[PDB]
Amino acid sequence: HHPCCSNPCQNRGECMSTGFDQYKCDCTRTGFYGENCTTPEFLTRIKLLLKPTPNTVHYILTHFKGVWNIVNNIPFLRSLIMKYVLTSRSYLIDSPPTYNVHYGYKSWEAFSNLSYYTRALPPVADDCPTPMGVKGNKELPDSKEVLEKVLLRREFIPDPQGSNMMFAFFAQHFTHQFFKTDHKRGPGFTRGLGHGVDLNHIYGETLDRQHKLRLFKDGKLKYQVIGGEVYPPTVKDTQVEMIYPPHIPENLQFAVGQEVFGLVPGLMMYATIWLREHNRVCDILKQEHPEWGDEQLFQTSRLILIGETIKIVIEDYVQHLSGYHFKLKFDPELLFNQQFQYQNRIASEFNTLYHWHPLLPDTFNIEDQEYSFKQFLYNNSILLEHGLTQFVESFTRQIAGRVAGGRNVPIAVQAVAKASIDQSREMKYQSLNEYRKRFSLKPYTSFEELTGEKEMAAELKALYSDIDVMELYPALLVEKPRPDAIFGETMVELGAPFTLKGLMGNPICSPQYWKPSTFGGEVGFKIINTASIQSLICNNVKGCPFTSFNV
Amino acid sequence: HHPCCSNPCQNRGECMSTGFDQYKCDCTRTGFYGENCTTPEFLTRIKLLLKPTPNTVHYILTHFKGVWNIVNNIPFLRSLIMKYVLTSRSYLIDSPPTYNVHYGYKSWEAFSNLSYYTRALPPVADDCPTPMGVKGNKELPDSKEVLEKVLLRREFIPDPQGSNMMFAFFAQHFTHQFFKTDHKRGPGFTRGLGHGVDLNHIYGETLDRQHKLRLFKDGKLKYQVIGGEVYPPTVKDTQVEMIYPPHIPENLQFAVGQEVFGLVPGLMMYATIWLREHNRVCDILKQEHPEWGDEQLFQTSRLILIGETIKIVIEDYVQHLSGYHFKLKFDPELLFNQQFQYQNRIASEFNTLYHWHPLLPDTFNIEDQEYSFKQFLYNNSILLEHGLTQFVESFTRQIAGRVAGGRNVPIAVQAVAKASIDQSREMKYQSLNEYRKRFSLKPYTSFEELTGEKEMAAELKALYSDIDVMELYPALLVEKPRPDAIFGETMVELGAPFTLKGLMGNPICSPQYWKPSTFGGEVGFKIINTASIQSLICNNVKGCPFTSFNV
Ligand code: COH
Ligand code: COH
Ligand SMILES: */O=C(/[C])[N][C]1[C](O[C]2[C]([C][O])O[C](*)[C]([N]C([C])=O)[C]2[O])O[C]([C][O])[C](O[C]2O[C]([C][O])[C]([O])[C]([O])[C]2[O])[C]1[O]
Ligand SMILES: *[C@@H]1O[C@H](CO)[C@@H](O[C@@H]2O[C@H](CO)[C@@H](O)[C@H](O)[C@H]2NC(C)=O)[C@H](O)[C@H]1NC(C)=O
Ligand SMILES: *[C@@H]1O[C@H](CO)[C@@H](O[C@@H]2O[C@H](CO)[C@@H](O)[C@H](O)[C@H]2NC(C)=O)[C@H](O)[C@H]1NC(C)=O
Ligand SMILES: CCCCCCCCO[C@@H]1O[C@H](CO)[C@@H](O)[C@H](O)[C@H]1O
Ligand SMILES: *[C@@H]1O[C@H](CO)[C@@H](O)[C@H](O)[C@H]1NC(C)=O
Ligand SMILES: *[C@@H]1O[C@H](CO)[C@@H](O)[C@H](O)[C@H]1NC(C)=O
Ligand SMILES: *[C@@H]1O[C@H](CO)[C@@H](O)[C@H](O)[C@H]1NC(C)=O
Ligand SMILES: C[C@H](COCCO)OCO
Ligand SMILES: C[C@H](COCCO)OCO
Fold first, then answer.
1. CA A401 → CA A95, A349, A370, B217, B270, distances in Å?
2. Which of A98, A340, A507 lies at the smallest CB-CB distance from B111?
3. CB-based contacts of A535: which residues, under 8 Å, 6+ apart?
4. Is B315 left (phi over 0), alpha (psi -120 to 50) or beta?
5. For ligand 8, is residue B8 a contact (CB within 6 Å)?
6. Distance between CA B484 and CA B98 in Å, rounded?
7. Which residue among B174, B351, B413 is best mutated to probe the pocket of ligand 2, counting the most ligand atoms within 8 A of its Cβ?
8. CA distances (Å), origin B251, targets A256, B230, B381, B427, B525
9. Could you tell me which of B191, B192, B186 has the C-alpha nearest to residue B426?
10. Of the ligands numbered here, which is closest to the C-alpha atom of A113?
11. CA–CA distance from A259 to each of A244, A379, A482 (Å)?
């Protein structure tokens, strides 16, 4: 078998076979040397001694509220700290990207072919004696058994951070522009060839689809008016393909950028909000530029919405998730004197870690109704019936489920959770502890350490035998959460670098794009730099209801 | 008409219309302010004071040969200066890219759509009152008159820098992997979606084509043996489509990565040399790695050949063109502590400036034969008749034509030269002086200043009337050359940033790729770092004839 099966190279050293039974570690620029890249250089020694752990930094960022209140109001300091946040997270991501599901070594194919998700760790080689390389049993435990024993919800566990359904559906809507797995090809393939925040879930992945969605007057997107309210146009009207069961009535077959967004009225809520926002920004730009044509209105509005999206994701969405007292800032200028690559390739593991199934409630509570999954799925009539204002008011008040801490996956989506496990295995993912090392975390030394409790840990112990072959995805959902938090350490330490890299990597953050003229002048630039989840709702939903990502 | 038609914003300020008759300039980070971005900040004043002209720096780099001999032998010093060369040129190229033929403003469409060449300057708006904006006559002069008066060769003018046919065919072969105009869409579109040095002209642009060219044993490319010599395989054998006239026999339809390389036996010469090189590197890698399969052998060989190509282009090809006594260095590590974007998008103007028609001789002289263009075109029998060794010996000794200085386009390709002019106009290129300003050069203030002589200048004056509406492409070919040089200032000052960006922007130059393990270990890595045009020929051409890019 492949001599690198055991993953012998540490500290980001790269493993290469040098014969049938021999390997060589390439320790270049790792800060370590020796056979397995485990002997630290002197400066590396010092650095390691001084480095606080991720849990320590998390403690600091979530305490001393008085101090952060001062820091937050000293722009120089706020900028200083945010600069540090951006730069330290980014170093963990290979950019230009490297591996993918078919290439455990760098290749022009893996670099150039955008149909692949990229990989933060190379796959376990096909001929390794065990699924995780050399450790563990010949087969991993039955995925249904892992699912039933430690993932399925017994009783709803609410998020102690107060995340609500506005949050849950924003997470789903936002991330499905770049997690678009191409199941015709396989789980390691994506249909999202822009690999980031291009808002294809609003505008369409292809030019053909975009043009069917556009009005070609005033830069705007097509729409329909039902009971005096603006909604996306129909499939019949646009000839845009959408996934809908055959029985859905014509006028409820809403057509939007992302073909799966008819699946859940919570997605169509945001689809409708962002469609209205696009047209609103068209109106503003036309006021500023009576001389502009439809094409420039459309394109400039799209760039503005991309900026608004990134703004909201950082200052509302990530802000909420982080639990930090420090106020995060979206400010491309902070990187202009830093080394940083304005590009991004979506990693398969980023997709996997974002399978936040436990967020989903047992029922969807709108106004005085409590809809089951069966009632809610593919049912845009609920959106029409209640209207956006009531959707916002209701989802803002409904709490979502805790993601870490175990046993909180709703049985309604059990097949999705099992598939997350099965697909990780098909894609030959390395173990939890290999991923922890890859992101500079200490490997767990026991199952009890992983979960922080005894019952689930004993079940995992009997299932997996060795903590070093525990899998990434189930581990994320059973991990001991941070104190009163929605996530554990692994989720945050992998998720944050992928996220900040996907946001800041966008060309609109680069110096030649980040200027008022890109956005039609100071008026457009201001729309981006003042964007918030509250103003998005206030501008586009009748009655300007209060909203936020916490109950 | 568009109020930015006059190109009012200077110093890279960005022009935006603000009503039908008004514009505003965005002076962000230009170092200037004021209505047209012409008022310098104080720092800017200081910089412009201590900034030597490109002609001054050229003088320094092409004199004091004894001093440069010292410098070239002090690795620290050589590195410092090469680092400066790389970084100063870099800043002139927008990366991530901005405009294209259809977008004179930034847009997601121009950013994301790889089928376009990008644009260093936006196109002149469709409704401008003159072709160059507002200056000049309502129509540009007849392109036939420009061609006949100042571009067509009377007597052959040899390159005083001594460039030979090995050089001219290397230029064509190398650049045609990323200048691949998609004529069914238009001159502003490319089929080269890799936008750089990906060696698609050897391996094919698509996976389907690559797989048809590959042997699938030992990592190798398919080949044929004729009279004991290795050549590319046939169209019949591979089912690879190639462009050939109907009268070419089956056995002479060589199939290579780039569909057009059957056009010219000098291109097939290099195609054969590089195919041999790939298979040679496969043999070396297999010796190092008896455990590797075909796929990894093939992929790793490709990365090595990409590295070899960049190495040769910098240290032999650009070295020769430059005329510098300073010894240029291919060393990705020079950029690792610098701000630099590892990506590239091919500019239309980079394609246009590379239409080095005047390089071509009146006849192609191999052994004791002198082939006409009609005899030479599409005639791979010439290659088989003389063999590669004789091709190399002959083309190494045949001098090429001077590109700048005027009246040196061979009549055989007059239609190609006229097309360069016409297609620049179709793509609505701004004027020579706009491009000069765009690349920090002083606008020419007369036709005489442009040409350095009186006769062609007075022709051009009669044709164009105003030096500020002189066109870029014909100006490159008539420009006053540097002393005894192949090119004038404009060609170099535009071509060098585009070139160094296209070379260093490659992912193999990034720190996660530039490691021996990427290239199968220290032996594979050393192939890149010791590559040269001479070694490429020595290893792959019977007899190891001497070669270089000068006669
Ligand atoms: C982030 C939060 C989130 C939420 C709230 C959510 C809510 C819901 C929901 C009802 C509200 C339903 C019925 C589903 C059901 C599904 N989800 Co999610 N999903 C979420 C994150 C994801 C991600 C990430 C993917 C994978 C994307 C890909 O590759 O297509 C996904 C994929 C799926 C798939 C495709 C299965 C596959 O193998 O790719 C189904 C089915 N789902 N999910
Ligand atoms: C750099 C030197 C160079 C040389 C030596 C050279 C040598 C020769 C040669 C005989 C040896 C012949 C018969 C031609 C003839 C042609 N050249 Co060149 N070409 C060169 C650089 C280019 C470039 C660059 C293009 C545009 C490429 C595109 O968009 O495909 C080009 C395009 C062409 C075209 C198509 C026109 C177009 O609009 O693309 C023809 C025909 N030609 N050339
Ligand atoms: O789509 C999949 C999973 N496989 C395709 C393959 O797809 C390529 C993927 C995976 O290799 O990588 C990225 C490539 N994208 C680009 C832009 O290069 C994809 O093309 O493409 C192969 C070749 O096109 C397909 O294999 C073909 O081979 C046979 C011909 O000998 C056919 O009979 C096959 O059915 C198929 O057409 C492969 O299916
Ligand atoms: C490099 O890593 C290998 C593991 O892949 C080390 O070999 C192991 O060493 C431990 C402790 O010394 C033993 O318990 C194992 O039995 C060894 N396994 C194998 C497969 O050899 C090796 O010692 C490391 N090299 C260095 C210099 O530390
Ligand atoms: C890149 O842009 C080109 C030019 O707009 C696109 O080509 C057009 O595609 C539409 C359908 O989407 C066709 O109807 C036109 O015939 C095409 N025009 C030309 C000039 O070729 C191309 O689709 C775009 N590429 C992507 C990936 O969107
Ligand atoms: C919705 C949960 C259905 C579980 C069906 C499979 C039961 C196997 O799971 C068992 O469930 C018990 C009850 O929570 C636990 O006490 C055990 O630790 C667990 O192993
Ligand atoms: C869809 O929602 C409506 C309420 O708008 C509800 O009455 C209906 O039963 C739902 N449909 C299904 C199939 O559950
Ligand atoms: C700016 O340039 C325009 C040319 O369009 C010129 O008319 C005007 O005087 C300039 N303004 C200043 C302040 O120099
Ligand atoms: C092709 O080249 C051969 C020499 O190899 C020459 O004899 C022949 O005439 C050429 N063909 C044409 C059409 O000129
Ligand atoms: C999962 C990740 C957590 O970030 C929180 C701290 O940055 O954010 C969402 O993408
Ligand atoms: C035209 C340009 C000149 O380069 C010389 C660098 O000093 O090179 C093209 O690759």
1. 34, 22, 16, 54, 63
2. A507
3. none
4. alpha
5. yes
6. 36
7. B413
8. 54, 14, 10, 40, 37
9. B186
10. 3
11. 9, 15, 36
**Separation of CA B59 and ligand 10 centre (Å):** 55
Could you identify the residue written with the tokens 């006949």?
Answer: B148
Q: How far is A20 from chain B (nearest CA, A)?
A: 5
CA distances from B203 to A240, A504, B189, B232 (A): 37, 34, 21, 12
Q: Which of A6, A13, A5, A3 is nearest to A39 (CA)?
A: A13
Distance of CA B96 to the CA centre of its chain: 19
d(CA B274, CA B252): 18
Nearest to A440 by CA among A42, A28, A53, A125: A53
Inter-chain Cβ pairs, chain A and chain B, closer than 8 A: 141
Which candidate, B391, B392, B412, B408, places its Cα nearest to that of B400? B408
Q: Can you say whether residue A334 is alpha, beta or left, with left for phi > 0 and alpha for psi between -120 and 50 degrees?
A: alpha
Cα–Cα distance for residue pair A488/A272, rounded to 1 Å: 33
What's the burial of A29, exposed, middle or buried (CB within 10 Å: 0-12/13-18/19+)?
A: middle
Domains of chain A: 1-41 (2.10.25.10), 42-551 (1.10.640.10)
Q: Residue A204: left if φ>0, alpha if ψ -120 to 50, beta else—which one?
A: left
Q: Which residues of A are less than 8 Å from B510 in CB distance?
A: 95-96
Q: How many whole angstroms from A207 Cα to the centroid of ligand 5?
A: 7
Distance CA B358, CA B402 (A): 6
Token pair for B525: 């890595």
Please indicate whether, in this complex, the C-beta atoms of B112 and A194 are within 8 angstroms of each other: yes
B530: CA distance to ligand 6 center in Å? Answer: 64
Q: Environment class of residue A514 by beta-carbon count within 10 Å: exposed (0-12), middle (13-18) or buried (19+)?
A: buried
Helix axis angle for A265-288 and A380-397, nearest 10°, is 90
**SS3 readout for A301-353:** HHHHHHHHHHHHHHHHHHHHHHCCCCCCCCCHHHHCCCCCCCCCCCEHHHHHH
Tell me if A302 is assigned to a ligand binding site: no
DSSP string computed for A405-444: SSS-B-GGGHHHHHHHHHHHHHTTPPPHHHHHHHTT-PPP
Whose atoms come closest to the Cα of B62: which ligand?
11
Q: What angle do CA B21, B27, B30 make, to 5 degrees?
A: 145
Ligand 11 and B499: CB distance under 6 A: yes
Supply φ then ψ for residue A122, to 5 degrees. Answer: -65, 155
- Please enumerate in sequence order all residues whose Cβ is within 8 A of that of A415, keeping only pairs 6 or more positions apart, or say none: none
In degrees, rounded to 5, the angle at the alpha carbon of residue B326 between the alpha carbons of residues B321 and B330 is 75
First to last CA, chain B: 53
The runs of H, that is alpha helices, within B371-509 are: 373-376, 381-397, 414-426, 432-438, 447-451, 455-464, 472-478, 489-504
* For chain B, counts of helices (H) and of strands (E): 24, 10
Q: Is the omega angle on the peptide bond into residue B96 within 30 degrees of 0, that is, cis?
A: yes
Count of CA atoms in the C-beta half-sphere (13 A) of A70: 3
Resolution in A: 1.9
**DSSP characters over B471-510:** -HHHHHHHSPBSTT-SSBHHHHHHHHHHHHHHHHTSGGGS
Which residue has a Cα nearest atom 4 of ligand 3? A185
Tokens of A453: 């409790």
Beta-carbon contacts of A355 under 8 Å, excluding residues fewer than 6 positions away, are A416, A417, A420, A473
- B28 to chain A: nearest residue by CA? A515
Q: What are the DSSP calls for A372-399, one per residue?
A: -HHHHTT-HHHHHHHHHHHHHHHHHHSB
